[PDB]
Amino acid sequence: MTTNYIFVTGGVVSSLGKGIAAASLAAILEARGLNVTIMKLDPYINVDPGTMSPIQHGEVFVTEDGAETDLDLGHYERFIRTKMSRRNNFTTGRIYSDVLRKERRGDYLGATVQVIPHITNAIKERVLEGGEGHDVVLVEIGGTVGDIESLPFLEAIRQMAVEIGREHTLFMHLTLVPYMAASGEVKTKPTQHSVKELLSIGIQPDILICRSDRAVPANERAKIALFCNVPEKAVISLKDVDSIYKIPGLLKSQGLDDYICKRFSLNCPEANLSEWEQVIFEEANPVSEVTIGMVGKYIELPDAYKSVIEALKHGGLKNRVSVNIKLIDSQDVETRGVEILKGLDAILVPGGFGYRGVEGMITTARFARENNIPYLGICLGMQVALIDYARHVANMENANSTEFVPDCKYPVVALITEWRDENGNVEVGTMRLGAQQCQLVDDSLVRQLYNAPTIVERHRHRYEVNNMLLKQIEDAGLRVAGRSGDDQLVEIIEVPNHPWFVACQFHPEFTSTPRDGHPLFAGFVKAASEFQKRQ
Amino acid sequence: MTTNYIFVTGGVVSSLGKGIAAASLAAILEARGLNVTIMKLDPYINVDPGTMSPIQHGEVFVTEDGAETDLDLGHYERFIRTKMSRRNNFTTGRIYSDVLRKERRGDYLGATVQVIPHITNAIKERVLEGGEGHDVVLVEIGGTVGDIESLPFLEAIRQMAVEIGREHTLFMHLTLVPYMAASGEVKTKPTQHSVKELLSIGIQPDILICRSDRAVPANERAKIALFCNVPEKAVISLKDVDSIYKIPGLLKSQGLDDYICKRFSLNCPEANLSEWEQVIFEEANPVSEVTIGMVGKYIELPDAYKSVIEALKHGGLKNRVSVNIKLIDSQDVETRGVEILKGLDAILVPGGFGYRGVEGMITTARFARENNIPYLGICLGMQVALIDYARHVANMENANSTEFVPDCKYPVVALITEWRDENGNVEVGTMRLGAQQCQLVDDSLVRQLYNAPTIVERHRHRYEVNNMLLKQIEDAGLRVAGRSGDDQLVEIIEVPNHPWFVACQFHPEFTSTPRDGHPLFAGFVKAASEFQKRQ
Amino acid sequence: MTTNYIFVTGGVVSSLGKGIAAASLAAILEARGLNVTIMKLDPYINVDPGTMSPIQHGEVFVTEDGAETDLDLGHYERFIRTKMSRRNNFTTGRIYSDVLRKERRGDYLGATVQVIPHITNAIKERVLEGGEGHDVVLVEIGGTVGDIESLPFLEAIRQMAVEIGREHTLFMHLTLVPYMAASGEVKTKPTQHSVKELLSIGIQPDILICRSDRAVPANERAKIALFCNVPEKAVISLKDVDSIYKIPGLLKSQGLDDYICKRFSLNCPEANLSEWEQVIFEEANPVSEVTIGMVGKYIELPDAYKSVIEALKHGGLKNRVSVNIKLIDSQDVETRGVEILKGLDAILVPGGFGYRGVEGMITTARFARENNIPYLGICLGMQVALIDYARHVANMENANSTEFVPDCKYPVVALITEWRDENGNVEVGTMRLGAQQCQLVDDSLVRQLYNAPTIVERHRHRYEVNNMLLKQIEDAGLRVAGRSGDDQLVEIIEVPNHPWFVACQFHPEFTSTPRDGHPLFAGFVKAASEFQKRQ
Numbered sequence A, B, C: 001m002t003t004n005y006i007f008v009t010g011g012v013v014s015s016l017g018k019g020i021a022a023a024s025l026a027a028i029l030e031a032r033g034l035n036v037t038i039m040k041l042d043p044y045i046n047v048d049p050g051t052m053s054p055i056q057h058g059e060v061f062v063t064e065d066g067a068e069t070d071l072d073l074g075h076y077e078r079f080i081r082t083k084m085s086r087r088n089n090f091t092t093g094r095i096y097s098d099v100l101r102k103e104r105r106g107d108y109l110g111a112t113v114q115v116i117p118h119i120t121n122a123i124k125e126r127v128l129e130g131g132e133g134h135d136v137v138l139v140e141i142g143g144t145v146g147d148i149e150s151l152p153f154l155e156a157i158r159q160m161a162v163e164i165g166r167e168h169t170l171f172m173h174l175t176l177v178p179y180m181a182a183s184g185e186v187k188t189k190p191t192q193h194s195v196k197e198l199l200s201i202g203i204q205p206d207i208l209i210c211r212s213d214r215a216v217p218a219n220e221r222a223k224i225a226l227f228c229n230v231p232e233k234a235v236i237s238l239k240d241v242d243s244i245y246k247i248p249g250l251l252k253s254q255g256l257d258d259y260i261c262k263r264f265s266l267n268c269p270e271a272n273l274s275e276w277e278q279v280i281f282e283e284a285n286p287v288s289e290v291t292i293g294m295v296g297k298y299i300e301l302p303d304a305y306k307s308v309i310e311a312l313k314h315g316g317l318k319n320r321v322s323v324n325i326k327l328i329d330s331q332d333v334e335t336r337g338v339e340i341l342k343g344l345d346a347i348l349v350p351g352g353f354g355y356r357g358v359e360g361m362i363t364t365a366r367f368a369r370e371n372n373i374p375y376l377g378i379c380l381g382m383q384v385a386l387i388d389y390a391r392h393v394a395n396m397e398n399a400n401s402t403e404f405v406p407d408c409k410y411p412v413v414a415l416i417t418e419w420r421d422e423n424g425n426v427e428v429g430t431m432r433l434g435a436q437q438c439q440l441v442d443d444s445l446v447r448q449l450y451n452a453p454t455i456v457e458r459h460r461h462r463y464e465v466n467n468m469l470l471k472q473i474e475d476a477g478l479r480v481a482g483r484s485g486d487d488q489l490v491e492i493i494e495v496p497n498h499p500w501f502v503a504c505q506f507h508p509e510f511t512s513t514p515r516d517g518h519p520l521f522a523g524f525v526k527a528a529s530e531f532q533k534r535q
Ligand SMILES: Nc1ccn([C@@H]2O[C@H](COP(=O)(O)OP(=O)(O)OP(=O)(O)O)[C@@H](O)C2(F)F)c(=O)n1
Pocket: A186, A187, A188, A189, A190, A220, A223, A227, B114, B115, B116, B117
């Protein structure tokens, strides 16, 4: 049984929600019992997003195998239960890096190395590597058709369609159908022009996904069909929705999955979207409303905390609570004080690097601890929680991380190599990425929530809890809730004289989904609801 | 059984021989017992070529039904036995004229008349009119893909393909694969770029006909296939050939007809190209060689006399004579004299309008008559022969046509409505177009050549033989060999004291084919051979 | 005074002679006293041609500074006296390698690295780096407009034109104007379509260079001007020529350099092409004809020996001898013997790597030595000359290079590190690239020819003459003619019991020009003429 490919392209504009559309379609196909996966081809030159700023790119998503990937793989894992790996995301940078190394080494045997066939072959190889052994592979092409950056990807998939054959390949193209106030009509002209552009590259689209701020009526869909060599039933309306969880239903409603199953000769039962219907229901029917403050340094781009924002949303679903997420610049806490943290039912400090706004986060963790306001700290959120406690409870003056103040007396957070005590005494592979097992301390808040002794979560951090200064903070009342490895590194801390205070080193947001939620975020949003009642 | 359409387009350059290629492919399909026709879509604004100079776009071809058409319909009739009519040729001018007519009187009922759907509908309607009731319809699109003028034709046939279905429609695209001396290789890049241009208008070609001055090798055909979404077997080499009669064989040897019959699900036997093999054999195995002078006013563009040139070649085939056609400017006969008519084994004066170079043709007819050199006069060629005899034998000094000298004493050639005698006395559907019956005189040369009392030949002329001055020329020894209609108009004249001197009003070149030849031209070339032997 | 840029692009096909056209125009501009340079932007992914096979790419050209570059820089140095360096040639591979290293390091400070601005900025930087400090910079863009591979280069130079301003930038675009036999006309349609393609990328061409097998007449140039927004005087005909040395004259004849000087506001005297007129004259008026055999392993692509073929041509100019260059596969000498070396007035064995066909070259050097046939050996040509002599005169059985037979008893050629004697005894930065001074032995044939004690030539070789086995070959009659460095490496050898036998380690072909010739190649072709007389 041959692997089938759906090549997903975008026209007219970016910000179409190509990832969500691909993820939603994969959700439908998975709900028909098909083995489905998705991969993201990014046209940027970065070898991977490891070097990309949260404020410019958005969050670096981390897979089980510890790959640093586009945040779209977050969308993928939140819509299908197939696990993403390094094989599900690559950049132009990776491809050119691959080919350059093969070339300098001498693997091409004196050949002229060319965009075709050498760059295109490298792209095709990685697509087959990620795709083979599945029923359907959705291959999302980053960039916009008509731009320079995506042309090698478009040429590569054109070749793949011919080689594999059109019996097992489809081209799905997203376009913008914008509304004009003047005439009160949605416009098909950009779709007409975008399809000609895609054809000029050698690709006849099979399916058109028409993005608009409203439903694309039958007349406009018929016009698109007429001009684009596409049957009317293969022209799909995908309007702006109040919830992305509705998109699987909207696509199924227009028979998109039936068309795909027919084209690929797949006999599978009707999509059971009951789990998505349940999610849509939960979201539309909240009993309470809470305001949770996310206090961090990358707030000028919310996508910097994409998976965190979505994990809070999933916590809301499982408690039937509407979570009003307030983004509060941690630097504003330094400037204007803890008055901007007033009127919050809970507080979350997410991950980050660099000292800018960290003193604000330390002040925020203090305010949360002293006023019994529910707190969740992720990576840097655990660091500022340990610093706050060490500094203000265990009386370790100016206790900090070596990342921020390298020569500080009390480096409560530092690299395993840098570990020292207050007198400068020492003991007799630095970056941690991906899935690692963590042992939960018995009778701990997290042990209850996770409802198991051992959990698996994903790391992306360099700086650890200094084990040499740990005992002095433990004696001062702080509780180690979780540990991992032969080195017994601190994964989770708690403040037990508090309604809900948890802080973890790993990124729990990367394992949270709308359907299965997350124990930690469920507990956090519950505690936020309970706090809101007591006022 | 549904009618099948092959849309024949050209890329890179014009002058690819789109007509000869379509005609040659039609010849193969006809040899497999298929009911095949061809039609030409011309992007020029002329409502028809009736108002076009011969030196402009070539000869005006005339069908049986008296349609003035593109010379390509000459190629069609010389390659298939299916007769051409008005509905096998239309222009942009014709389409716009019909739509404007319908619009001005109010057929469109207050609608905005647009390129789509109104112009494209009109194009499709005329394609179905000429096509339906055949197995395979070849639709030649004039102009080059990428130009403005052919876009409405290309959009129209794109729509037809979708409507009729790809089960019964193919796109056959000719390109130039030019040779570069610098590198000693033929170049596929223009084909690559032309196919992207054709795709950008919404048409994926199914077959590529690669024109070059030599065979397009396997490597180049594979490269074209790789880049153009076309299977290797549908990439056809059409090199420059010494004889166009070989082209059906070249295309068949690459399985083009097999691919078409498979795609259209037509169960028909292998093509028997015996009739074309015979024509090729005749042409390659001549016994004698003759030089025939064609003395006219349009020699600067040979295609002005396309059908006449081919008729002479068909004459050669039937006699196993190799005909060297020497094009001689009739104005050079006026200036330099009969010196340039020496060394000719026969003389042909073809049709034309306007007085420029006519006196040279009259001088030429005289030279051919007085020196007993075989003479064939067509339309104007007959006028100048009558003028010659009237002026130099019947002693009617300054005898001319009213076309050239309206106020001449002896208008031996004039419109029926101008007919007057030498004293200015008179007697008591001006334009004659298409097939008309002609009665042949019992003791005439043509009666024995045609071997029938009545014949059918095609007219395109206004100015007739003046019947009022005819009997005076008849008494001077001129034979009337043929007449027609109620008004007994002179169709053929002969000089009986001469080896071979014939001149007709009609265009015998339009019914001459390479396979069936033509009685008159067969006779004329025989006389040219006989004259050559006697010298 | 601002540096002016002429961006030279190609359309329709490659193999237009973009390099020759750019080089020829630079020659004219240099002849007006302007400081002119040229650079080649190659779209291949190879970081440089160092790793490219001669049989696939052609020769690796070597500049003074020891850069391995496209053979086009050979054309540049043979048309202008400005010296080429690493700065005058770079690939897509170099640009992507630059950007990837900056990115991984962290030079982009967390930015998304994109084709625009990061790849385009890298291209612009290298163009400015090679261009600045000249009056006019010709920037040759490799690939064909309309292809994927050159788009980053085209976008980069589009930006440069806007930034620098159109007062100091011109776009010069080459196209093919092919001849069609059928109509007997050259076709402007590909030029029309190529200019639209270039405009679609954001570039309005200022100058059109029309390549054809004949002159492009005024009517066709006027048609190109009409459709392309280019004045008729900026549409240049560049027909196929029997000599590339004529091209400067043909371009000046059409005022190309006047237009450029006007557009860039350069007041400079009329181009003095006297040196080119002298070269054209010399070439057109040979007194003798010689047949020189070039016996090597890369003969299936003559461009593998591009600069060698041209150096022989320049030798012909300086002696007024027509050099008939016969390419003889050295492997055919192994198969069919020295019978295929019969009827040669001289023999040249050029550079190469690998053992394939080397035994044929050793046999060829023997035949040349024994029969007193003039011999020139370049790099591998010196190796096979030293091997032949050592093996057949000094009686060193199976004497070879360590490159070919690593464990041979007499490694007469080997790396400086590998150097051993016949008993395996040894003495108590391997690749040599670019200009190195060489000391010529007094009373040597080369000392006479070069007419100086010290010469500067360019190296590209790993394997040296083994100094430990040298004395035994010297005693056997062989003469060291040139040496270099502190290690006193053998640069040139001679056989003094021979009319003309020279072999050098360096590549003299890279310093040979049509105007100034080359002492060594002048001497070689002279000796070939003298040998031809004695028969
Ligand atoms: N390839 C094409 C397609 C169409 N048109 C012409 O496009 C014209 C209609 O222009 P509109 O109303 O702006 O476009 P719409 O298609 O209705 O798309 P929208 O949904 O954005 O309104 C017709 O005259 C035409 F003639 F149909 C054209 O000239 N060439």
